[PDB]
Symmetry: C2
């Protein structure tokens, strides 16, 4: 069974929920997901986890010491350490398929200004490290990106190109709008053709990059 550990200063936010895809996986016994409060590894009364950046700039950077103790306790040399960040290598469907065979994923959630770089540098001396982006926008912390990665990966676990065109179900006419009649005909070959053409025009319009063309 696969084990996923998540580390965050917002533990309530990432606590697993029974009625969800990861919730079902856990219940089928196919995965163990544990959430850890980063503040468990702090010593001071005020339990501080970040500080102003060396060299100046906005916001705060998470301290290396606290992350060091957390990952020392949670990770082994076998661990794949996942770190969401706007500056990461791209997380894609290939990435999801690959991670779906892993024994132990640890996901380190940190603020967007970053965890002190020495943390990832240190971890890399003992385990495989993957800093990754799920897309080109900014989140305040890695938490929401962790939830996307967990969804993408777990649905590919055993036992759990081109854009898709429009899809339709009953009734065949609704508010004066009809389902494309080819879909009603039962001709497998004609239906395959119409769907291919629909996918072509959608991909060219919305995602020309996928077909090897310049973006808008």
């Amino acid at each position: 069974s696969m084990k996923i550990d998540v580390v965050t200063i917002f533990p309530e936010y990432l606590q697993p929920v029974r009625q969800s895809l990861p919730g079902k996986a856990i219940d089928a016994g196919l995965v163990d997901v544990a959430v850890h409060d980063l503040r468990r590894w702090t010593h001071d009364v005020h339990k501080s986890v970040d500080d102003s950046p060396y060299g100046g700039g906005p916001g705060m950077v998470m301290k290396p010491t606290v992350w060091g103790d957390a990952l020392d306790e949670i990770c082994t040399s076998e661990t794949l350490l996942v770190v969401p960040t706007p500056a990461g290598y791209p997380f894609t469907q290939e990435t999801a398929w690959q991670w779906s065979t892993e024994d132990h994923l640890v996901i380190a959630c940190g603020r967007y200004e970053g965890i002190d770089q020495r943390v990832a540098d240190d971890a890399a001396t003992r385990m495989r490290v993957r800093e990754v982006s799920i897309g080109d926008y900014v989140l305040n912390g890695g938490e929401a990106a962790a939830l996307v990665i967990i969804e993408a990966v777990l649905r590919l676990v055993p036992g759990v190109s081109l854009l898709e065109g429009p899809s339709y179900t009953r009734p065949p006419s609704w508010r004066g709008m009809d389902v494309p009649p080819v879909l009603l005909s039962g001709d497998h070959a004609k239906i395959a053709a119409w769907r291919a053409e629909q996918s072509r025009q959608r991909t060219i319009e919305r995602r020309p990059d996928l077909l090897g063309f310049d973006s808008p």
Copy 2:
């Protein structure tokens, strides 16, 4: 004050949590977020929300009569309707900035196989509709994508290029590794030039597509 309505068959999973950024905004009174269970608008005892695809194929497609009623109740002509889908236009930082000044966002979460296309086509005749992808991977449903979109938009509400390089804070030395000396130099022109070169090298290595 911004209003966000989220429509889903997984209401617990999407319930706001106090200990989060969206939870802070809500308690600060900068947004009101409302989560609705789609099953509220079903017709039968089974609370059916999908049905087999015309033309055949795997998976199921969400019913137009059910989503139709739900959006009639929730949306107004001022609504910007958001539909996460792998087939969408890309959601980017530019998109988040645009939506951050909207009065009413409604986010329709469905399974990845899709919602009957006539729902969006119908809605687009009396309100603004945006189908968007948050990245090139497959989720079972739009729920996690909605959390990401809400996160990116809300942090841009008042009150709540190249890649960024490495960042550092105290202590100066840790486990045999020193913060790069130039950052403690007090030469802020040189610091900006060093950070630009770090950004350039990191972008070459991790995202060469951005050049």
